[PDB]
Amino acid sequence: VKKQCFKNDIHKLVLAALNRFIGNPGIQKCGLKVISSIVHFPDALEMLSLEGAMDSVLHTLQMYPDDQEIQCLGLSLIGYLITKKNVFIGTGHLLAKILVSSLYRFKDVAEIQTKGFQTILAILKLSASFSKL
């Protein structure tokens, strides 16, 4: 059933819906939740990386600094869909900027900090140069 759903181009449709429509934050929360459910599917990673979902997630985090649920879902997601290509040859400055900004703005929220630090550890597992950034 999951393979059939994936073959139905669910990822492309949901990414287009949440990327083309940057307003109406409710659809953004729904899209982040749907992607979060998508990622742990058996074949999710390769198509998600090919479609370029990571840029959409980063843009969503940029346009919604103050919302809590969007930030939590995005910070949990970023570590999930991060690949070596996204931090290729040591380049990952928008990643560090967004992660530090999100963690600093919400310092007391335990869940946001936990997700952000798990994401940061996952990123550091790939490339050690990121720490410098």
Binding site: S49, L50, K85, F88, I89
Partner: protein, 128 residues
């Protein structure tokens, strides 16, 4: 007058627009100074390396997908013996493809390096 009062307008000889939505990362020039003025481009708009050929005198763009990972850098090697010309590619996976500048069916890989090949600069000291 202010638009015409510029050196950018005098010394910008040609301007070529590539096909829609292509991300080319590296370029080299087919420069034997007498063979064929043209450009080799390494596309990166997809995670499967494409080598494209740009004929300058006709603005002809012909792409070809040959690499599993995106091409990072390109280099042109010219061996004077037998008038040999080749072009070598460097892929993100680590491979190193070599295809003839003239012949199109001379694909042959080389040692698969540990990681990505970020430079392929070629020069002679004597020996190339």
């Amino acid at each position: 007058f202010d638009i015409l009062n510029s050196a950018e307008l005098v010394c910008l000889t040609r301007r070529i627009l590539l096909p829609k939505n292509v991300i080319v990362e590296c370029m080299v020039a087919t420069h034997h100074n007498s063979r064929n003025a043209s450009i080799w481009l390494g596309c990166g708009h997809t995670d499967r390396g494409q080598l494209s050929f740009l004929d300058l005198n006709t603005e002809g763009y012909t792409s070809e997908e040959v690499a599993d990972s995106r091409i990072l850098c390109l280099a042109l090697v010219h061996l004077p013996v037998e008038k040999e010309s080749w072009i070598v590619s460097g892929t993100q996976s680590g491979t190193l493809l070599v295809i003839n500048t003239e012949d199109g069916k001379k694909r042959h890989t080389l040692e698969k390096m540990t990681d990505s090949v970020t430079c392929l600069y070629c020069n002679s000291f004597q020996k190339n």
